[PDB]
Design an enzyme around this catalytic site. Structure first.
Site, mmCIF file in Angstrom:
data_model
loop_
_atom_site.group_PDB
_atom_site.id
_atom_site.type_symbol
_atom_site.label_atom_id
_atom_site.label_comp_id
_atom_site.label_asym_id
_atom_site.label_seq_id
_atom_site.Cartn_x
_atom_site.Cartn_y
_atom_site.Cartn_z
ATOM 1 C CB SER A 193 43.139 38.704 36.196
ATOM 2 O OG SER A 193 43.232 38.188 37.519
ATOM 3 C CG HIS B 134 39.158 39.797 39.264
ATOM 4 N ND1 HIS B 134 40.111 40.790 39.334
ATOM 5 C CD2 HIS B 134 39.771 38.725 38.705
ATOM 6 C CE1 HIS B 134 41.248 40.347 38.826
ATOM 7 N NE2 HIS B 134 41.065 39.098 38.430
ATOM 8 C CD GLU C 159 39.763 44.521 40.545
ATOM 9 O OE1 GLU C 159 39.876 43.289 40.395
ATOM 10 O OE2 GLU C 159 39.830 45.306 39.591
#
Ligand SMILES: *[C@@H]1O[C@H](CO[C@@H]2O[C@@H](C)[C@@H](O)[C@@H](O)[C@@H]2O)[C@@H](O)[C@H](O)[C@H]1NC(C)=O
Ligand SMILES: NC(=O)c1cc[n+](COC[n+]2ccccc2/C=N/O)cc1
Ligand SMILES: NC(=O)c1cc[n+](COC[n+]2ccccc2/C=N/O)cc1
Ligand SMILES: *[C@@H]1O[C@H](CO)[C@@H](O)[C@H](O)[C@H]1NC(C)=O
Ligand SMILES: *[C@@H]1O[C@H](CO)[C@@H](O)[C@H](O)[C@H]1NC(C)=O
Lengths: 535, 533
Positions: free
Chosen positions: B200, B437, B324
């Site tokens: 990330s 995510h 995601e």
């Protein structure tokens, strides 16, 4: 009279006719060819609405096709069957408003459902006399009463100075409407049922059908409609009043000509001079665009086809609509560089982008890039085979498939019973290269039943296929439902709805039901592209 | 006194701790100061090297977590809490952790340096999912992780000023990278084989080090998991940073020197309390204080620098997880919750798109809606829910990743790409969220190898495969087993073939085109649509 075939003598409103006994493969049919339905639209009558045919004395010979309406003759591939099959097969004349009737022989004993064919050809071409429109197989095999009319094309049919008395536009459509009125009055003389009339047409013919659906004075003249690869909505079938005025006044300049003066001068011009210049008035290098087409006049068409389909009530209407597998490919070889019937037409990325500009001539740069972006295979963005096929799809989707999707959706949402098809069989006899697929127009010969003629060299499966299609089409004419009422065993053709979006494949295999007519891509063309235009 | 746990670094002596991994012991040296505490007048300023110390510095315990926002959305729910600080918050947080094999490596060992994510506003190297012992025990790796300043403390910028230059959390990372160059050989690490990996915001940080020349001498290979320097969230312009810092200063009651001086008087939580109030629109996957295009750390935008860079002597592993976007939906988009199936209406989808693509004009948002609507099932709530997730994931991660991968490959980098599609059996988020995510990290780090955590046997075998890909990548710049002769192989990502692999419980499968059509919409068309309007 006295020595002739008594079963070929018929009277209509305008007088006596003598028809001809034709041989169809299964037996004889009755043909009444070259019946005048209007005063010749010639001299001072050019550009004017048609006036009904004044009665004749004696027996009018109706044994041969009449003149083809004055028109441009495509000379791209001279002597090539693929192009010549569409070219005029009778003398070109402005005296051309004649219609043709085929019926069983002897004529039907009881009132018989009528099919009226309206030909295509971009509103600049076509004839009801072409071999692919031969009504003898439908007449013989299905017992149909078949009618086809000639209507004025090009400038003669569609040149408009909107608001004028002398060239009000849309007169080719009024020609068609008068034939529909003729059928109402006269078809019972042949055993036809004026209370069961189905219009069918292809390309410009199908746009024409859809325009009769959207024009009130026409709606009393038929009960069901079939639109094949054409629609009144979409980018090519109409022009604004302003654009018609612009095109007419440019055509006028190009031939040496207050609308009265302008029009008076155009009427003094040789028919061929108008034909020689008509193509020169298009605002951009285009394909699938035609110079003189129906105009949104606020009369025949009270508003745009788009607006009329969106707000119309279509409750008492059954419609059969569809497309062929490859709507766009035919048009590529006539205007997009890199495309030819004589090679594989594998194009470069540069030729793809130039072709999008020709295929979507009204697009801004951003709109054109949206088209390119959408149609590119981003795994293989330079692949010549994909680019060629995507160019075809662009043209087919934009001009036919998505307008058809739009029409079926609006019509079904608003109470019409709609049946949708994709025609996917390539005639074994086809002279175009394989890459072109099943091109625009190449379903017609099957619907009319030509494979039934043993002399044409179609296969046995194509004979049977054609018989199936003839059944669907005549079943639909008869009932507004193409399914056999008897035949529960065969797969059923469900109506197209906005909820399920069902349509069937027409090919050598039995009916297969599919869902969504290019649903994802047609959202691009029908929902997004409009919003992108106005920005 | 265990001689294995005694290390001399440039700053002085350290004592680490013998930790237990399931395979056997590892040496951990935790809480090593790599910088002067960035407190007082040092707040918002670049870090300075840590002054030498006397005696033996105790490195047996994680140090404090950089001062940050703590999430409160689902209090005591493991799925959100696993990201929350697990040590005390402090601005005095510039410390780093080193795991090594026990005994320490006989010869110089490739180094993996973990940079955590958390949107540049949160995160810590001490979280359980970043535990380096498994990689050290099983793969013999030297694993390093650092704390770096986040939020206003790491990223508040008054570009052009001396005292709030911006990008200091990245400078913190860089300083830790310099520390590794200067010191890692003492632990058995090879400073000539350093691989950055991060996820990330940590992956975006790795990409910024790729795009900033002073960082390039400090590492050799990079792994970017679910994040990129390019894209809509990882950076702001200097103008937007100045405006956000000025707003925040206005909000807490505060000429640059004068403004920054007043901000330095403010208690840490007063800054955190107003962090989130400076965003220009209601949004998700958008963060207040992030790297700034300063013309210094970043000489141009990541977009400009990836387009025009020369990446010949670089190897990169990049990838995304299957879903995601799902995670971000519960944090701003109405109709979305972990506690139900989140089946939404069409109206909730269009509204969600304005929040998920906050920078979109009416027309651009309409393009998004039209692209992502399934026109066969236009009003189907399950479709609209999954499409909403996809909009967010694609916009923020998948398409930026594909863009980066392609620019890197076209410009000389050796690139490997993956999609991670295994959903942990222990995941506490609902099923509709899929593989969210952040939920590949526990596998890469090798947590399933710990029997107490209750992963399945297949997940242990899978975690072992992934640790191998990552460390092989670290060793060689190629994730393939150099003596594994059946597989199949993981091919480099290229612009021609666009090949990537799926990471799941089945053997590698090669796929071509990472959302090619949809990412062309995001990467090529949207930029033209927004600009034109
Ligand atoms: C395919 O054909 C296009 C036009 O043909 C002209 O006609 C063809 C049949 C050629 O053989 C040649 O005599 C002329 O160029 C071309 O525009 C197109 O480039 C052709 N494709 C290729 C690359 O051969
Ligand atoms: N007068 C005209 O509008 C006109 C327009 C286009 N073409 C082109 O002929 C190719 N073509 C041939 C058959 C059917 C349609 C088409 C149209 N393609 O754009 C001839 C005349
Ligand atoms: N300070 C901030 O910018 C910020 C942004 C978002 N959230 C909400 O946390 C959700 N979240 C949790 C983990 C990772 C990213 C995100 C961002 N979603 O928009 C808190 C603070
Ligand atoms: C059909 O086949 C015959 C026999 O080979 C041939 O002579 C004739 O020209 C063909 N007709 C058509 C229309 O293809
Ligand atoms: C589930 O919970 C959310 C948030 O509490 C709420 O908006 C909704 O009623 C539920 N989700 C849907 C849209 O079914």
């Amino acid at each position: 009279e006295g020595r002739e075939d008594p079963q070929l003598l018929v009277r209509v409103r305008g007088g006596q006719l003598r028809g001809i006994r034709l041989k169809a493969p299964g037996g004889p049919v009755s043909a009444f060819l070259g019946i005048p339905f209007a005063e010749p639209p010639v001299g001072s009558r050019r550009f004017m609405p048609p006036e009904p045919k004044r009665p004749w004395s004696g027996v009018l010979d109706a044994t041969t096709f009449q003149n083809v309406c004055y028109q441009y003759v495509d000379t791209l591939y001279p002597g090539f069957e693929g192009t010549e099959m569409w070219n005029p097969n009778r003398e070109l004349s402005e005296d051309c408003l004649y219609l043709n009737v085929w019926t069983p022989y002897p004529r039907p004993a009881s009132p018989t459902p009528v099919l009226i064919w309206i030909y295509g050809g971009g509103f600049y071409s076509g004839a009801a006399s072409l071999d692919v429109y031969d009504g003898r197989f439908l007449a013989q095999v299905e017992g149909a009463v078949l009618v086809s009319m000639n209507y004025r094309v090009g400038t003669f049919g569609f040149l408009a100075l909107p608001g004028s008395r002398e060239a009000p536009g849309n007169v080719g459509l009024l020609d068609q409407r008068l034939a529909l009125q003729w059928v109402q009055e006269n078809i019972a003389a042949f055993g036809g049922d004026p209370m069961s009339v189905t219009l069918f047409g292809e390309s410009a013919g199908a746009a024409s059908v859809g325009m009769h659906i959207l024009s009130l004075p026409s709606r009393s003249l038929f009960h069901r409609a079939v639109l094949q690869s054409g629609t009144p909505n979409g980018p090519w079938a109409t022009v604004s009043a302003g654009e018609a005025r612009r095109r007419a006044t440019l055509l006028a300049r190009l031939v040496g000509c207050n609308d009265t003066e302008l029009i008076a001068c155009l009427r003094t011009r040789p028919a061929q001079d108008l034909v020689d210049h008509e193509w020169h008035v298009l605002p951009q290098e285009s394909i699938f665009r035609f110079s003189f087409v129906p105009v949104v006049d606020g009369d025949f068409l009270s508003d745009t086809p788009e607006a009329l389909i969106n707000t119309g009530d279509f409750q008492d209407l059954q419609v059969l609509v569809g497309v062929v597998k490859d709507e766009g490919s035919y048009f590529l070889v006539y205007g997009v560089p890199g495309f030819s019937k004589d090679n594989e037409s594998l194009i470069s990325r540069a030729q793809f982008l130039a072709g999008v500009r020709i295929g979507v001539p009204q697009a801004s740069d951003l709109a054109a890039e949206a088209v390119v972006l959408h149609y590119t295979d981003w795994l293989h963005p330079e692949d010549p085979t994909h680019l060629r096929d995507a160019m075809s799809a662009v043209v087919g989707d934009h001009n036919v498939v998505c307008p058809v999707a739009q029409l079926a959706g609006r019509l079904a949402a608003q109470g019409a019973r709609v049946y949708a098809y994709i025609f996917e069989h390539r005639a074994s006899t086809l002279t175009w290269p394989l890459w072109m697929g099943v091109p625009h127009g190449y379903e017609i010969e099957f619907i009319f039943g030509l494979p039934l003629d043993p002399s044409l060299n179609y296969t046995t499966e194509e004979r049977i296929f054609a018989q199936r299609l003839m059944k669907y089409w005549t079943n639909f004419a008869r009932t507004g439902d193409p399914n056999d009422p008897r035949d529960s065993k065969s797969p059923q053709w469900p109506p197209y709805t906005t909820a399920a979006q069902q349509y069937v494949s027409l090919n050598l295999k039995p009916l297969e039901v599919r869902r969504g007519l290019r649903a994802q891509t047609c959202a691009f063309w029908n929902r997004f592209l409009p919003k992108l235009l106005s920005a």
